[PDB]
Amino acid sequence: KVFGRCELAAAMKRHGLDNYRGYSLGNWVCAAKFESNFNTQATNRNTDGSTDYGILQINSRWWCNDGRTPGSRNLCNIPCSALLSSDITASVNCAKKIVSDGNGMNAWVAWRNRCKGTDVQAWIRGCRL
Ligand SMILES: [Cl-]
Ligand SMILES: [Cl-]
Ligand SMILES: [Cl-]
Ligand SMILES: [Cl-]
Ligand SMILES: [Cl-]
Ligand SMILES: [Cl-]
Ligand code: NA
Question: What are the catalytic residues?
Answer without folding.
Answer: 35, 52
